[PDB]
Every structure is written in C-alpha cells, then in structure tokens.
Ligand SMILES: [Zn+2]
C-alpha cells in the first residue's frame with residue numbers, strides 16, 4: 001500500500017529524484033519527479049515513461065499495450081562523469 005500527491009511548486013529539491021528529459025506519456029508531467037515507470041516490453045527506441053501518479057494507469061499505443069510491463073525507476077542511473 002502506497003500513494004502520494006503533490007502540486008507544482010518547489011518540487012525540484014531535496015525530496016525526490018528529478019528525471020530530466022523524461023516526460024509522462026499519460027498526463028504530460030515533465031520533468032518526471034519521484035519514480036519513473038519505464039516500460040519493459042516496449043523497445044529501447046520507443047521506450048515509454050510514466051510518473052508514479054500514472055504508474056497504475058493503462059495506456060495503449062501503436063507499440064505500447066496493456067499487456068506490457070512497467071519498471072519503477074526510483075533514482076536515475078547514468079555515467080555521472082567527473
Ligand atoms: Zn503522469
């Protein structure tokens with residue numbers, strides 16, 4: 001059991017992961033804060049991303065479908081050069 005909500009203010013700050021570039025393909029929230037649900041079924045090119053809010057939502061597109069699965073991405077993992 002888990003569920004959280006928030007508006008649009010002082011969001012980008014010590015509290016939740018701020019994913020830049022990734023936008024929710026459900027509501028349209030970008031950047032995506034918190035956990036970024038990245039589809040697993042979809043290809044690496046047509047990879048989708050849903051916000052924790054739209055994590056329990058169902059979206060079906062040309063490629064994406066309801067059967068497809070989603071991966072809860074808490075923190076963003078990259079090269080972190082430097
Ligand atoms: Zn959303």
Ligand SMILES: [Zn+2]
Pocket residue numbers: 039040041042048063064065068069
């Ligand atoms: Zn998919």
